[PDB]
């Protein structure tokens, strides 16, 4: 497929209406709601959306009832683009051709674009219909783990802390897992609990996902050939779990593609 | 009385050693977990679990239940005033760490908060009401409370600021986060729905009274005169009280902390 390219850009068409919707309806300084958008609707891959989004799919779950938790994915890796371009972290100037967000609305508001984003994902996840309130709790946790001072921003810390110093392979496996790895295996992970997905099911899908994230951790005739083999590896564990998983696996050769 | 003070001496004591505890436990890089501690077991007030605290108690429930909620929003209050402290917007963080750890340990305590809120229940609190608690919260902190405050106050330092503008910055900077201390208080403790909305309106008039001596403490007397500013406040002071009483609940330990807000 084919059928998936068709699946993945009718999503990307929802999440990117849906982020927009979710912006819009702010009822606060518009400077913020200006800041928030900027980096938000500057566009990306959105990986983590279709992720999600495509695990709910491979479950048999209409992926619409996902789409809240999908934006607030989105909002949680836009917050932390924000605050890592800034000229105290790595100091970015342009992003996909844009200049970076403290660069039009200044540090201060750039930094409160990052904080606004980061709290407003977690009101998406709880404010909500037909994901159930055992499950909502979950995924809130899983989130907040992912995303926070054992997850995300552990790996940033640890990736800060390293001053011009040639740092160690495990002190790198560190780095890569919890700053990027996480939040892909979390959208994954989200993706699995909204559909239903049962334990073993769920640990097979996350063991693709890290595989995907190392592939990922990777985006030279020899690191093509590492990139293949976690590729590899991940579509394994995808046909372990016994789900519709075509999205998913074509996400994962697009990674390989390139 | 000397009954409240012991109260809220012995809740000061449980969000502290809860506070250090919850930092101790993090398996993450260690500079991240002392600028997180370094800012979060500073050690004032506390003023906003104790609210919570006192609002538990005043319903009748253990407090100790609705510790992890108190603890979750002092993190709150504490990244705020990391993130505030920026050069670009008292430990001060990111002198002592750089302005990069300071930025990360106030993203991790706002995230780290969302955790501690959902992971309760060995122990007690029902799963509806703490999706409950995570709602009002991110609302209270987020684009549409505490930071739609600090943006407001942000788009317009150097701008004179009429009343309307000054009261907004303070009811959604300051105003926001000790409504919900109150707020979840009253959630967790199991209020009637009629008693919730008078604590709020307590909350609320609470809230404005503890900027308006913030300023007299030294404008609120720049737009006011400084009878003014006084009169505003004792009317708040008088409304808190009036709520408090319309309750009603045993209240004396958030009297108490109203009557202290009344001092000066």
Same mark, same amino acid.
């Given at each position: 497929?084919?059928?998936?390219?068709?699946?993945?850009?009718?999503?990307?068409?929802?999440?990117?209406?849906?982020?927009?919707?979710?912006?819009?309806?702010?009822?606060?300084?518009? +400077?913020?709601? #200006?800041?928030? $958008?900027?980096?938000?609707?500057?566009? @990306?891959?959105?990986?983590?959306?279709?992720?999600?989004?495509?695990? %709910?799919? $491979?479950?048999?779950?209409?992926?619409? %009832?996902?789409?809240?938790?999908?934006?607030?994915?989105?909002?949680?890796?836009?917050?932390?683009?924000?605050?890592?371009?800034?000229?105290?972290?790595?100091?970015?100037?342009?992003?996909?051709?844009?200049?970076?967000?403290? +660069?039009?609305?200044?540090?201060?508001?750039?930094?409160?674009?990052?904080?606004?984003?980061?709290?407003?994902?977690?009101?998406?996840?709880?404010?909500?219909?037909?994901?159930?309130?055992?499950?909502?709790?979950?995924?809130?946790?899983?989130?907040?783990?992912?995303?926070?001072?054992?997850?995300?921003?552990?790996?940033? /810390? $640890?990736?800060?802390?390293?001053?011009? #110093?040639?740092?160690?392979?495990?002190?790198?496996?560190?780095?890569?897992?919890?700053?990027?790895? +996480?939040?892909?295996?979390?959208?994954?992970?989200?993706?699995?609990?909204? @559909?239903?997905?049962?334990?073993?099911?769920?640990?097979?899908?996350?063991?693709?996902? /890290?595989?995907?994230?190392?592939?990922?951790?990777?985006?030279?005739?020899?690191? +093509?050939?590492?990139?293949?083999?976690?590729?590899?590896?991940?579509?394994?564990?995808?046909?372990?779990?016994? %789900?519709?998983?075509?999205?998913?696996?074509?996400?994962?050769?697009? %990674?390989?593609?390139?």
């Amino acid at each position: 497929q084919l059928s998936v390219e068709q699946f993945l850009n009718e999503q990307k068409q929802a999440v990117e209406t849906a982020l927009s919707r979710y912006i819009e309806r702010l009822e606060g300084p518009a +400077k913020l709601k #200006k800041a928030m $958008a900027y980096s938000l609707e500057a566009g @990306g891959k959105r990986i983590r959306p279709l992720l999600l989004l495509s695990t %709910v799919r $491979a479950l048999g779950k209409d992926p619409a %009832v996902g789409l809240p938790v999908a934006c607030a994915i989105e909002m949680i890796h836009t917050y932390s683009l924000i605050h890592d371009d800034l000229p105290s972290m790595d100091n970015d100037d342009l992003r996909r051709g844009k200049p970076t967000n403290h +660069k039009v609305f200044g540090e201060a508001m750039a930094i409160l674009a990052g904080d606004g984003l980061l709290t407003y994902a977690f009101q998406l996840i709880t404010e909500d219909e037909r994901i159930p309130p055992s499950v909502r709790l979950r995924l809130i946790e899983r989130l907040a783990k992912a995303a926070g001072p054992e997850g995300m921003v552990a790996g940033q /810390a $640890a990736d800060m802390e390293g001053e011009g #110093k040639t740092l160690t392979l495990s002190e790198l496996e560190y780095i890569h897992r919890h700053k990027t790895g +996480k939040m892909l295996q979390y959208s994954v992970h989200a993706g699995a609990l909204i @559909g239903g997905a049962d334990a073993r099911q769920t640990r097979e899908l996350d063991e693709f996902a /890290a595989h995907l994230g190392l592939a990922f951790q990777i985006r030279l005739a020899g690191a +093509k050939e590492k990139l293949a083999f976690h590729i590899e590896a991940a579509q394994r564990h995808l046909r372990n779990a016994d %789900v519709d998983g075509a999205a998913l696996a074509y996400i994962c050769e697009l %990674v390989a593609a390139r």
